[PDB]
């Protein structure tokens, strides 16, 4: 039902497995998975994207913007490029 995604700095993020399968990487990598290179202020945002993606995919209720603060954009870009999501 759930998986645990652990950041580089030890934070443990517990998310629905279906939500984690949003990332093609995580599908292959996968219960528990460590991300030695992704810190917690980035992994938490990745989990938010998982929630956002599953909630608003194939819905016609008005889609809001996914917000990304400037300070996290590059790492999130690298995380997203790594995660293939």
């Amino acid at each position: 039902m759930y998986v645990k995604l652990i950041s580089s700095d030890g934070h443990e993020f517990i998310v629905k497995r279906e939500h984690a399968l949003t990332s093609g990487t995580i599908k292959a990598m996968l219960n528990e998975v460590n991300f030695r290179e992704i810190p917690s202020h980035v992994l938490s945002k990745v989990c938010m994207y998982f929630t956002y993606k599953v909630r608003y995919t194939n819905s016609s209720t008005e889609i809001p913007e996914f917000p990304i603060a400037p300070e996290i954009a590059l790492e999130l870009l690298m995380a997203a490029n790594f995660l293939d999501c």
Binding site: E12, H19, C47, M48, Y52, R55, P67
Partner: protein
């Protein structure tokens, strides 16, 4: 109506959704299913406000507008420790690097 939450204790964060009309007690059942501890051994919080088992999440201040999938609302979680409860303690996430010159 769905609310979208982060239940946080120490270095643990649970991402879950719930109905605005569901109860604090029902949210503890979600936590129990994941972190083993029974509802009677849990204390849930909105900021520094202890939430009562019988209140709905809406009644505590978690609504569709304030608790969104791309910006979930935080629920603090504290466990029983021996004769009493541990203090509420949420470890902050890592800090972001300063903005490179290009920005």
């Amino acid at each position: 109506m769905d609310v979208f939450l982060m239940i946080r204790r120490h270095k643990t964060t649970i991402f879950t959704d719930a109905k605005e009309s569901s109860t604090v007690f029902e949210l503890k059942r979600i936590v129990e299913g994941i972190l083993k501890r029974p509802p009677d051994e849990q204390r849930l919080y909105k900021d520094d406000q202890l939430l009562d088992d019988g209140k709905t999440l809406g009644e505590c201040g978690f609504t569709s507008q304030t608790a969104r999938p791309q910006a979930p609302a935080t629920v603090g979680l504290a466990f029983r420790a021996d004769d009493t409860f541990e203090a509420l303690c949420i470890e902050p996430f890592s800090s972001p690097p300063e903005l490179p010159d290009v920005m």
